[PDB]
């Protein structure tokens, strides 16, 4: 009869196939293809730090199974 | 050639086909239905208010293309 919409936040852990060498802008890339976030709206954190773009994960100390956060731009 | 996590706040918006005379508890079991949260898992909010499992749609103004917000609750 009536549609209604119902806007809802998860919290939703994503896994990632990368290398020690991917730049952060190519896992921002990666995000993107999953799940459909432009890469200019997204923030990566790893122990408190922002991630810089033309970084790497080593560049971090970014480990296999480390787990990084994202948070998007408002 | 690594796995690692990036846990983030998701955002997913859903449609639900309603009557304005459908109770709350009634639309959480569509919500059940289409995502697989259970109705007492649900916290459901609109304009601001939670909504009460007895109460009907209409009783809070909700009319065609309203939009609910919906967090999770334990």
Request: charged content about 30%; hydrophobic content about 35%; proline content about 4%.
């Amino acid at each position: 009869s009536m549609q209604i919409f119902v806007k809802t936040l998860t919290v939703k852990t994503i896994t990632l196939e990368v290398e020690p060498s991917d730049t952060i802008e190519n896992v921002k890339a990666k995000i993107q293809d999953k799940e459909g976030i432009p890469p200019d709206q997204q923030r990566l954190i790893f122990a408190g730090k922002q991630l810089e773009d033309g970084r790497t994960l080593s560049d971090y100390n970014i480990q296999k199974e480390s787990t990084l956060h994202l948070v998007l731009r408002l």
